[PDB]
Design a binder for this molecule. Structure first.
Ligand SMILES: Cc1cc2nc3c(=O)[nH]c(=O)nc-3n(C[C@H](O)[C@H](O)[C@H](O)COP(=O)(O)OP(=O)(O)OC[C@H]3O[C@@H](n4cnc5c(N)ncnc54)[C@H](O)[C@@H]3O)c2cc1C
Ligand SMILES: Cc1cc2nc3c(=O)[nH]c(=O)nc-3n(C[C@H](O)[C@H](O)[C@H](O)COP(=O)(O)OP(=O)(O)OC[C@H]3O[C@@H](n4cnc5c(N)ncnc54)[C@H](O)[C@@H]3O)c2cc1C
Ligand SMILES: NC(=O)c1ccc[n+]([C@@H]2O[C@H](COP(=O)([O-])OP(=O)(O)OC[C@H]3O[C@@H](n4cnc5c(N)ncnc54)[C@H](OP(=O)(O)O)[C@@H]3O)[C@@H](O)[C@H]2O)c1
Ligand SMILES: NC(=O)c1ccc[n+]([C@@H]2O[C@H](COP(=O)([O-])OP(=O)(O)OC[C@H]3O[C@@H](n4cnc5c(N)ncnc54)[C@H](OP(=O)(O)O)[C@@H]3O)[C@@H](O)[C@H]2O)c1
Lengths: 399, 399
């Protein structure tokens, strides 16, 4: 691979990539440009233990496996010239590159109807966001969440534990409409409702007036704070300007190659093939950020290595629910292991397509999740009666 | 650009590309691999004048502006090795390349429910298809068309003119669901119905038994021949196998670059940015095939040339209706010029979005189409009252 290496973005995907470059044996220059003036850190605690307990030194990413990297923190890459092989920085400097890696992630989507709001409206992506929101998470305050996705629901649980009244507006009929089985989504709504979350389905925010939010059904919700969690948009502006193929995300193959020679991309900023669906998708999971970063680095140092091939999965910690989801949300059959109950929730879902496992969910059942991911990866076709039988040991079965 | 040049596919996009390479001044080797054993030819007459009059020598593409090209006709490219820079051919030979261009187009989608049918079921894409279908286009025979898109409707008109009884099954509520304003689609249904086409909306074919087609509504249609026109699938298998980013189409930027260095793609096989919608789409128009091919070639020979930038448009000749459509099918406003009538049809539609022209349709009104495409290209915001006023001259206005 061509030195020097320059990475744009200093999130999980970037850190994972540069650590793997070093581990795989690349000893040339690596320079990382990160617009946040923060020691690189992991985002999931921002909706949970950080939001609750406030210690950022418990959430930093370990860069020790990435020795001899210059991290330019608090600096924004403004453009790159793919012919000159240079990157223009906000501090006035220019970096040369042999290989450029775009790991710029994604930014929260804003709600146009709250654009000119005069009440506190925040999104939750950065340490700065978390600190700002947390400052207003006072007991008996009223929090309104817009969006029924995982970030909002993680925040909902954390806020309720802090004694914050929580209302949530979801424009669709169900929570977690993206990459979650309906059976899971239905249960998760039941759980949050039972914890005091005031859920509003099939409602959209139409605007706001002096501390009160307005909805499509002509009604009102007053709140001390709105946190908007309606998804993210890829940070692909530099790629678009430089002539790379992008569409809310930079298109890459399994080697992380963009359409521009010597420019790669990885993490949340990418649109890539989901091997289960066979379609291109923006995969915005923590596991993708890390594993795609590692795979792209490994193949750069050793071109005989295979391309990225991992199947997608994530977790979401929502109060008492430790949720794990792998693969596709549905197939032609769902198998349920255990009872689906608010009384000490513990259950496993298995999605199949023509007898083949194409997805799985575990709630408070991590022991089963790893063997199911192994079964999923090889497209296993186990006996559906055995899969249902609670007598069955999935770990054993995966062999 | 790097010699030698090898192009896979010998359709309109390929011919247009190689002619532009030569015209722009590239004098190195060009070899084109075409799986059809046919002198390169244009496809639109296959649903019209060829289907009716049968002379293939009236439909060949002019390769005269492409001198010194070796056309390997009747040969299939089976794979390419992007590291070795070679292409493996079905006749046992291998071609070396400096630059590889994938212009392999798309193939008609098959209908799974007719997979094991015992009655004649054809698609219409090639000269061989056309000849085969035409052999059965006997007066008073009964033709069933599956799909409400342009190819089927063009065939419907040609068949009706030949005295063939025509029934058509469309799974959606309207014809031309892709890239046609609803106002146009509604009128086109009225026209075909008035010409004797038996239109069946919101019906799907569920199967067939001994010369009779079965539908989702539990009913039957008997026919002497079925022509299936339910869209196409990109011929991107070689790209997928070689590790390029694809998803029913090869992703390319405005230079025609794929994710693989030294490999380009153009025409029906590509997924590319539509500058009006700002989204990636497979654009399967004749004008795209030609203009994208020309643009990619021009930039290969002269890297200072801009990338492909044309806005999409097509025509469709359906009996008495000469239809032209440019840009987006809808905006926040449609302006109608003229009466929409089966009595000597002649009218123009203009789609606007926040005052800006984003699309237009002309039916039997070619004079207006060129100035509207010029207005469209520059994002014109004309006075909506003037646009409506039939006193207005659009050609004048476009200046
Ligand atoms: C609140 C929260 C909770 C989460 N919880 C979960 C969870 O329960 N499960 C799960 O699977 N995932 C969770 N995620 C974590 C998530 O999946 C990862 O953070 C993400 O996938 C990492 O991707 P990334 O490194 O590509 O992007 P990012 O983390 O966004 O990093 C990209 C960095 O590049 C910066 N950048 C952008 N443009 C430029 C530029 N021009 N110059 C320099 N820098 C630039 C960005 O500002 C950013 O700092 C959560 C995320 C959040 C925000
Ligand atoms: C019946 C019909 C009517 C039409 N009428 C209209 C119309 O009214 N308006 C309009 O805008 N467009 C019309 N189109 C025309 C159309 O838009 C063009 O034909 C098309 O866009 C050309 O794209 P192409 O050159 O990329 O692909 P193609 O024409 O499909 O050419 C690709 C060629 O590559 C070959 N190939 C594939 N794989 C390999 C391989 N491994 N090795 C070698 N060769 C390979 C294919 O077989 C094919 O011959 C019509 C098409 C048809 C079929
Ligand atoms: N996966 C995780 O997803 C995290 C981030 O995304 P997120 O939690 O903020 O959102 P999300 O997981 O993508 O889901 C967000 C919710 O907002 C809704 N939504 C999307 N666009 C909207 C709009 N324009 N107006 C109103 N609602 C809209 C979505 O519902 P719909 O599906 O109905 O659009 C969805 O319910 C990633 O970090 C990753 O961890
Ligand atoms: N544009 C032109 O389009 C030409 C070729 O495409 P075409 O005319 O054959 O098709 P098309 O223009 O893409 O439209 C085909 C019709 O078939 C329908 N269809 C798609 N998939 C189907 C399925 N699985 N089962 C039943 N119906 C289905 C589509 O309706 P839906 O939109 O409802 O899918 C559409 O009405 C190109 O050559 C180009 O000239």
């Amino acid at each position: 691979l061509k030195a020097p290496v320059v990475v744009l973005g200093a999130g999980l995907a970037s850190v994972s990539f540069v650590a793997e470059l070093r581990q795989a044996g690349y000893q040339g220059l690596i320079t990382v440009v990160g617009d946040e003036a923060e020691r690189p850190y992991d985002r999931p605690p921002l909706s949970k233990d950080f939001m609750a307990h406030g210690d950022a030194e418990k959430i930093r990413l370990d860069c020790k496996r990435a020795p001899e990297v210059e991290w330019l923190l608090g600096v924004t890459a403004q453009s790159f010239d793919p012919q000159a092989h240079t990157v223009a920085l906000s501090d006035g400097r220019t970096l040369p590159y042999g290989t450029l890696v775009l790991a710029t992630g994604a930014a929260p989507r804003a709600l146009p109807t709250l654009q000119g709001a005069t009440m506190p409206v925040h999104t939750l992506r950065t340490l700065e966001d978390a600190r700002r929101i947390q400052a207003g998470l006072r007991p008996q305050s009223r929090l309104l969440i817009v969006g029924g996705g995982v970030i909002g629901l993680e925040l909902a649980a954390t806020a309720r534990t802090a004694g914050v009244h929580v209302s949530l507006v979801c424009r669709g009929p169900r929570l977690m409409s993206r990459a979650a089985p309906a059976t899971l989504a239905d249960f998760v709504a039941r759980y949050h409702a039972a914890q005091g979350v005031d859920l509003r389905f099939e409602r959209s925010v139409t605007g706001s007036v002096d501390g009160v939010v307005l909805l499509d059904d002509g009604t009102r919700i007053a709140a001390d704070m709105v946190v908007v969690g309606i998804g993210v948009l890829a940070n692909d502006a530099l790629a678009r300007a430089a002539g790379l193929a992008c569409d809310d995300g930079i298109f890459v193959d399994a080697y992380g190659r963009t359409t521009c020679p010597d420019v790669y991309a990885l993490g949340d900023v990418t649109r890539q093939r989901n091997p289960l669906s066979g379609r291109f998708e923006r995969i915005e999971t923590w596991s993708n950020a890390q594993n795609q970063g590692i795979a792209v680095a490994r193949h750069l140092v050793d071109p005989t290595a295979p391309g990225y091939a991992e199947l997608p999965w994530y977790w979401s910690d929502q109060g008492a629910l430790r949720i794990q989801v792998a693969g596709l949300a549905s197939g032609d059959e769902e198998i349920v292991r255990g009872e689906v109950s608010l009384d000490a929730p513990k259950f496993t879902l298995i999605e199949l397509q023509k007898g083949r496992i194409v997805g799985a969910t575990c709630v408070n059942n991590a022991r089963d999740f790893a063997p199911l991911r192994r079964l999923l990866a090889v497209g296993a076709k186990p006996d559906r009666a055995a899969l249902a039988d609670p007598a069955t040991d999935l770990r054993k079965l995966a062999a």
